[PDB]
Design a protein around this ligand. Structure first.
Ligand code: HEM
Ligand code: HEM
Ligand code: HEM
Ligand code: HEM
Lengths: 141, 146, 141, 146
């Protein structure tokens, strides 16, 4: 649903990221492949080493997307509908994976912004990432 | 349960620098804030209306100290993990009637808390290790049912 | 999301219920308590025998609600917002349970309307009941 | 795994009146229609665009016959259920990489199908019984992982 405070908190914290967004993005990706190995099946062609530019590069691609969605918050099913077709109809990604990427995305934001990561914020980013996932799996429900 | 040499030690490595009187209460607290339906189980603790009310509850943080005790414990008995929690299993299972999915939840928020204090010391290889511990700890408690 | 066909199929089949709605409702309830015993914790005071009027009676209460939601389909967060507060904020029901009541609600509709229960319909009522649940757990996300 | 005398027999009771060349294919079919993301696993079967395409696919219903074979099988070995599927476990686990949640899904649609044909013979006490079987069957396949 995202009450007002929610979308308010989200902005501030995601604002506190800025240029780091790209870096945090790749960190998140890396944390996932490592903790939940099963997820690597979707990126066969990839080089998954530590420095890997594909990951470093795809890390920014995802970061920017979240940024854009933070922007057009009051309207995500439109701003993301391009990715829905890709993730849902073309790639057919198991819904459960979206849960794993959200967890790691939070683990990262709480290791670089311990000043921002409060129970109140923590709770908002979860609701937010929650929505964004629904949107991407849209053509499953 | 799978921890390889470095993991085995790495996990224990951090665990020593863990402020025992903080983390326990902070993890039990965030759980109640982020996943509201879990409050149903702790009526007796009192006021849990505002996130501050939760974080500022003596009983909450006093009980949280007992939860980390259970981890420190099973963290020292990785071999027979599926037997150290035998009683807590029977307890949370047919005494309290907690759906197991909920064990997974508390496991993850603990991770968030550890990563919160150890800032940059909490590396991916570390997170990956701790994720396995947490998993076994949860898998154990649900064993009573299945 | 509920594409057009979806909400269309839903009407027809739920239309095919009519006076049975109340009966089917109680059947669903009974099937749940029996298959997933853990669910009985929310109805302590209740008499859960086979004939039980509380069940027979509460069975209609739930049926009517679904009917109403079938009606105001194009707007559920408003038509159900009263129940949300009750199920979410007052009772604090574990989200997973909603999944168990939906399954049993389908098991019943396919034992009384085998003529209607087609893959296409089956698929629509699932998406439907799915939404209705989200709506009821609204203040959790 | 828990089936009490009547359940034990009741379950087997219906199972005999089960048209083996129908149910298997119908269950595997509905799964692909109701939960679209599971199609990713069966590209090789061909056209699965329209619900009719699915239901009218020889390979689909031909394979579905194999799935019920696995139930009929484990249904006769309730004692060592967690070992009859040992191979299918290793297969679906590290060969196909299927998330276990999905096992639960196919388990429930099978229930929907049985209740579909046996109309009113499929009583609550029966459903309750079959739900346990289905549950063990799924719990077994995921065993490889945990
Ligand atoms: C936070 C949720 C997610 C967002 C915001 C997201 C965003 C993106 C973006 C921006 C791209 C598009 C790049 C392009 O235009 O080519 C992409 C591609 C892709 N995503 Fe995600 N994604 C999400 C979750 C996931 C998950 C959970 C998986 C599965 C583990 C996944 C697997 C992929 C794959 C395989 C591609 C194609 C990569 C290629 O071959 O170029 N994504 N994602
Ligand atoms: C791995 C996770 C968990 C561990 C290690 C754990 C550990 C404990 C321990 C050690 C006790 C105290 C037992 C005693 O003093 O004899 C306890 C009690 C309890 N736990 Fe947790 N617990 C876990 C997860 C949960 C979850 C997710 C819930 C449900 C929301 C829960 C609900 C309770 C309740 C209601 C009690 C009774 C508290 C009281 O009245 O004293 N626990 N837990
Ligand atoms: C299909 C989704 C559901 C719908 C449409 C629904 C609908 C209803 C309705 C109409 C009432 C309100 C009666 C009143 O005004 O007093 C009610 C009450 C209640 N519901 Fe549900 N419900 C749903 C799911 C659940 C689930 C999954 C549970 C938990 C197992 C549950 C537990 C209860 C309880 C305990 C009450 C209060 C009964 C009392 O003491 O009077 N409901 N529900
Ligand atoms: C309790 C549930 C299940 C049972 C009993 C079951 C049983 C089987 C059996 C017997 C085979 C054939 C193995 C052989 O002939 O050697 C098979 C193969 C397979 N299963 Fe299922 N299965 C289950 C669930 C699933 C689920 C949910 C998925 C994932 C969507 C899945 C995906 C597959 C795939 C992709 C294959 C390979 C098919 C081929 O190319 O021949 N199965 N399954």
């Amino acid at each position: 649903v995202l009450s007002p405070a929610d979308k308010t908190n989200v902005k501030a914290a995601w604002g506190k990221v800025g240029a780091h967004a790209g870096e945090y993005g790749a960190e998140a990706l890396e944390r996932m492949f490592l903790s939940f190995p099963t997820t690597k099946t979707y990126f066969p062609h990839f080089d998954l080493s530590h420095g890997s530019a594909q990951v470093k590069g795809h890390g920014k691609k995802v970061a920017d997307a979240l940024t854009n969605a933070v922007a057009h918050v009051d309207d995500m099913p439109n701003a993301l509908s391009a990715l829905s077709d890709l993730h849902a109809h073309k790639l057919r990604v198991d819904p459960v994976n979206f849960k794993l990427l959200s967890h790691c995305l939070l683990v990262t934001l709480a290791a670089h912004l311990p000043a921002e990561f409060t129970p109140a914020v923590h709770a908002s980013l979860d609701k937010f990432l929650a929505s964004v996932s629904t949107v991407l799996t849209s053509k499953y429900r | 349960v799978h921890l390889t040499p470095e993991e085995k030690s790495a996990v224990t490595a951090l665990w020593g620098k863990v402020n025992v009187d903080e983390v326990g209460g902070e993890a039990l607290g965030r759980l109640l804030v982020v996943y509201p339906w879990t409050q149903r189980f702790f009526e007796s603790f009192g006021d849990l209306s505002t996130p501050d009310a939760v974080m500022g509850n003596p009983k909450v943080k006093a009980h949280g100290k007992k939860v980390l005790g259970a981890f420190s414990d099973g963290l020292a008995h990785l071999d027979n993990l599926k037997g150290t929690f035998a009683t807590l299993s029977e307890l949370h299972c047919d005494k309290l009637h907690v759906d197991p999915e909920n064990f997974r939840l508390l496991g993850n928020v603990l991770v968030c808390v550890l990563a919160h204090h150890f800032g940059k010391e909490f590396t991916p290889p570390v997170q990956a290790a701790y994720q396995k511990v947490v998993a076994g700890v949860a898998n154990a408690l649900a064993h009573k049912y299945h």
